Write an enzyme that holds these catalytic residues in place. Structure first.
Site, PDB file in Angstrom:
ATOM      1  CB  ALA A   1      -3.967  -7.574  12.566  1.00  0.00           C
TER       2      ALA A   1
ATOM      3  NE  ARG B   1      13.670 -13.254   3.931  1.00  0.00           N
ATOM      4  CZ  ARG B   1      14.500 -12.240   4.128  1.00  0.00           C
ATOM      5  NH1 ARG B   1      15.513 -12.006   3.309  1.00  0.00           N
ATOM      6  NH2 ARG B   1      14.307 -11.437   5.171  1.00  0.00           N
TER       7      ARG B   1
ATOM      8  CB  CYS C   1       5.363  -1.018  -2.046  1.00  0.00           C
ATOM      9  SG  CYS C   1       4.934  -0.181  -0.499  1.00  0.00           S
TER      10      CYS C   1
ATOM     11  CD1 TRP D   1      -3.284  -3.738   1.832  1.00  0.00           C
ATOM     12  CD2 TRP D   1      -4.234  -5.436   2.937  1.00  0.00           C
ATOM     13  NE1 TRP D   1      -2.719  -4.905   1.377  1.00  0.00           N
ATOM     14  CE2 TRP D   1      -3.285  -5.962   2.040  1.00  0.00           C
ATOM     15  CE3 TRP D   1      -4.960  -6.318   3.744  1.00  0.00           C
ATOM     16  CZ2 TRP D   1      -3.043  -7.328   1.925  1.00  0.00           C
ATOM     17  CZ3 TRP D   1      -4.719  -7.674   3.629  1.00  0.00           C
ATOM     18  CH2 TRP D   1      -3.768  -8.166   2.726  1.00  0.00           C
TER      19      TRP D   1
HETATM   20  C1  LIG Z   1       4.812  -4.264   8.101  1.00  0.00           C
HETATM   21  O1  LIG Z   1       5.255  -4.247   6.774  1.00  0.00           O
HETATM   22  C2  LIG Z   1       6.246  -5.196   6.507  1.00  0.00           C
HETATM   23  C3  LIG Z   1       7.454  -4.816   5.913  1.00  0.00           C
HETATM   24  C4  LIG Z   1       8.436  -5.772   5.654  1.00  0.00           C
HETATM   25  C5  LIG Z   1       8.208  -7.128   5.991  1.00  0.00           C
HETATM   26  C6  LIG Z   1       7.017  -7.495   6.576  1.00  0.00           C
HETATM   27  C7  LIG Z   1       6.022  -6.523   6.838  1.00  0.00           C
HETATM   28  N1  LIG Z   1       7.040  -8.832   6.802  1.00  0.00           N
HETATM   29  C8  LIG Z   1       8.215  -9.355   6.381  1.00  0.00           C
HETATM   30  C9  LIG Z   1       8.696 -10.686   6.405  1.00  0.00           C
HETATM   31  C10 LIG Z   1       7.799 -11.769   6.990  1.00  0.00           C
HETATM   32  N2  LIG Z   1       9.894 -10.992   5.936  1.00  0.00           N
HETATM   33  C11 LIG Z   1      10.682 -10.048   5.427  1.00  0.00           C
HETATM   34  C12 LIG Z   1      10.270  -8.717   5.371  1.00  0.00           C
HETATM   35  C13 LIG Z   1       8.995  -8.347   5.863  1.00  0.00           C
END
Ligand SMILES: COc1ccc2c(c1)[nH]c1c(C)nccc12
Ligand SMILES: COc1ccc2c(c1)[nH]c1c(C)nccc12
EC number: 2.1.1.37
Lengths: 197, 277, 277, 191
Positions: B16, B60, B82, B258
């Site tokens: 966040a 998704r 990444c 970040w």
């Molecule tokens: C906290 O970093 C991430 C890493 C992978 C996903 C993320 C946040 N949020 C995702 C979502 C909402 N879907 C698939 C993979 C990830």
């Protein structure tokens, strides 16, 4: 949906065919003539929105993956993503409504996890169009489209394991595009555009 | 117009950082809908902001009706993973397979949230990713988002290397980054008592563990503590001291987060368009 | 006839509960000699007090000359280890072997630190141990210290069961304990956001982990967090967030430490004998 | 403590702990037959006021059970209790006077107990061996401020020899009885 266009002012289709070309088939159905009202492009990595407006306007946007058993340069989802992007570039602005149709075809090239992304970005689940002969499945295509009668041509009798086994065999063989399966899909469109006899 | 509170849709929210920046700037956040899968990241976002974030599971599974009823949104921010776009990973799977393809989910939902072409209301968006990627992936991302990124390095406002590409339409994204006196530029400015920094800026920090031993304490080298890492990334001290998390879990969350001084630089011009205090 | 800073000798100091309580009371501490062998405990006392504590390693290496040079001391506090005097240990070795015999190392150094005959300068001392001990060991400790203990249970001022014996001569050790309204007396007062307490007082917390799932968050059983444990023992939040410590080490340190409101009660009468603010 | 003339040496007042040495002190001319010795074996409930009520002491002797005797206590109990009662018995610093003390171990104290005893009594122990035929039969360690007690040491005896003797096995008062002889310069001789 779009409203019926009377026969006098039915104008020729402006077709955007991405990846594969469907000039031959379309002109076999009487949507094109000998003379180009169909823009064809296979590599859209550098084409932007202004390029689509330049080539346009378009009444139909068409895309399709490479043939089954022809190992491609791109990953299978690339054609889908690029088709969606350029379709967004070609869609008429919400201010001026006009008949605008689109169609994406997969020759069993997208795998299981690509099909979910397909049905997500295209907002419908695909239509299984098969080619049966002697009670055996020879070839098939999945189709996403808003073309009217695209949904009634689905074969629920064809299961997903059958399609996967077909793709396995016909890629281990490694056959070009069977455009005969998608040709009849365009016929519900001549009540919106001109017919060339 | 009258300036009203901002409504944010944060995809791949993490710990966040977006909500923290917006609240630390003094901006009233009316709705902050964050899409996060990691339960640890959701935990720290739930407690450190006391439930003001509306959490959504997977990007998704966000539908068009989801965007239409959760919204309207004024700020759509996102930073896709990444590990499949980075160059330092030999087993990377490119932009079209693996976690890299989650970028298109952002590009999808952004168009769902974009206002209709008759509505001229303010609507800003931002997408972050790593500078370390093959040139074809950066080109394709620029093609889908219909713009080119601005490269901002956290080294100018923080104590660590962190170069990231930022696509977006935020006001003044291209203006030069200028640091503040509160910003901790050198590593020694971020260490606890009786800790010396052999380097002045530590190299780019990732999820994994004489650059591994950058501090010297009482004549013996040592790695950095979690509090020191939070200061390097600019987070409030003890931001990730949540849910019995140890060195590994906290460094994992901060490694992919970040640099909040960079995000405050980007979000600072937003005070002119939304209600504040 | 004049107020001067207090001079403390703290044996088996730990996370420096004595120094923190004395400073919170606003008492000027001129010297705080702490004898401690645990490494992360010294790290806590070093960072959270910025090196005001003079650490002197093992208590059996402290000589008489060590006391006289480090001294004179005004306040000698100590708390011998508990795992060899308690009924929680089936392998308990009693007061005369194991870690229990370290009590005599306090009694030894206590007589070394007491003022000389013909010198009636103010001199206070306190020794703490657990109430759960064989009565022969309790009366033996009373015999060596030449006094009987007061029993204080932290439940009157904390949010946990912590009954301990306190030998010493501090002014007003027998006076009734009265909790201040800053003291968090029930478990709900110490929990982070979106966590409901099952009990109003949690059973005694030892160095190790029903009543071990005393929190319900989102309708499921969860354990206590390190920050919650710190509030139960009265320590500041993130007092132990030091040197990459996790759930394991922090609960050990807080499990064998003093409840700071109990020490505040015992130490508060000392303001009227030394320099204050 | 500077020596005392012969006309004024009073009978010695001794405190015996955990073991009794009345007979050995009578044999040396320190006690008269008939009482100057207080002997307590269990000092668990001894307070400072009890050691004070018992007449001012000149010698505080403590000793562990013998080497073979299966022990009631842990061995450090005798050392700690001896130290506590010795603190209770020594003169307050406002009035110096001849005061002596002795604690003897018969290879009962463990290796850690030896270090803690030497640290509490501020002296490294003295090894008093019984040696016949070139072989060490028995020995005792002593901590004391009795004047000539450190020169009675035997450096030939190593710690491993002592521990082997201990593993191989009455209280040998024969070894410690001679250590009191330098005290006749301060107290009465009864013949
Ligand atoms: C906290 O970093 C991430 C890493 C992978 C996903 C993320 C946040 N949020 C995702 C979502 C909402 N879907 C698939 C993979 C990830
Ligand atoms: C943190 O609690 C402890 C436990 C054992 C010892 C301690 C503190 N300090 C000790 C010293 C100074 N010597 C021996 C044992 C201990």
């Amino acid at each position: 949906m779009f409203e019926t266009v009377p026969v006098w002012r039915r104008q020729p289709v402006r077709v955007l065919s991405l990846f594969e070309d469907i000039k031959k088939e379309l002109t076999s159905l009487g949507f094109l003539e000998s003379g180009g009202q169909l823009k064809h492009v296979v590599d859209v990595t550098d084409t932007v929105r202004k390029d689509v407006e330049e080539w346009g306007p378009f009444d139909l946007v068409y895309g399709a993956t490479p043939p089954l058993g022809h190992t491609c340069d791109r990953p299978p989802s690339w054609y889908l993503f690029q088709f969606h992007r350029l379709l967004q570039y070609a869609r008429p602005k919400p201010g001026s409504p006009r008949p605008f149709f689109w169609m994406f075809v997969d020759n069993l090239v997208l795998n299981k996890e690509d099909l979910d992304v397909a049905s997500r970005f295209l907002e419908m689940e695909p239509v299984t169009i098969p080619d049966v002969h002697g009670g055996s499945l020879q070839n098939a295509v999945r189709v996403w489209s808003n073309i009217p009668a695209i949904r009634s041509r689905h074969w629920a009798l064809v299961s997903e394991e059958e399609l996967s086994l077909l793709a396995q065999n016909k890629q281990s063989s490694k056959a070009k595009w069977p455009t005969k399966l998608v040709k009849n899909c365009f016929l519900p469109l001549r009540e919106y555009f001109k017919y060339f006899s | 117009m009258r300036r009203r509170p901002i409504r944010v849709l944060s995809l791949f929210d993490g710990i966040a950082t977006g909500y923290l920046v917006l609240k630390e700037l003094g901006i009233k956040v009316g709705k902050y809908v964050a899409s996060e899968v990691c339960e640890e990241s959701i935990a720290v976002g739930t407690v450190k902001h006391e439930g003001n974030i509306k959490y959504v599971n997977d990007v998704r599974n966000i539908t068009k009706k989801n965007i239409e009823e959760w919204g309207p949104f004024d700020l759509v921010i996102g930073g896709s993973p990444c590990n499949d776009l980075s160059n330092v990973n030999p087993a990377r799977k490119g932009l079209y397979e693996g976690t890299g393809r989650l970028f298109f989910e952002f590009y999808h939902l952004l168009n769902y949230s974009r206002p209709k072409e008759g509505d001229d209301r303010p609507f800003f968006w931002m997408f972050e990713n790593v500078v370390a990627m093959k040139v074809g992936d950066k080109r394709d991302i620029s093609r889908f988002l219909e713009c080119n990124p601005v490269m901002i390095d956290a080294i100018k406002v923080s104590a660590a290397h962190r170069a990231r590409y930022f696509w977006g339409n935020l006001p003044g994204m291209n203006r030069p980054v200028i640091a503040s006196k509160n910003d901790k530029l050198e590593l020694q400015d971020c260490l606890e008592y009786n800790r010396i920094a052999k380097l002045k800026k530590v190299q780019t920090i990732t999820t994994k563990s004489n650059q591994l031993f950058p501090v010297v304490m009482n004549g013996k080298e040592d790695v950095l503590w979690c509090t020191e890492l939070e200061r390097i990334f600019g987070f409030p001290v003890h931001y990730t001291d949540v849910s019995n998390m140890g060195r590994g879990a906290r460094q994992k969350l901060l490694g992919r987060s970040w640099s909040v001084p960079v995000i405050r630089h980007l979000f600072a011009p937003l005070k002119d368009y939304f209600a504040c205090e």
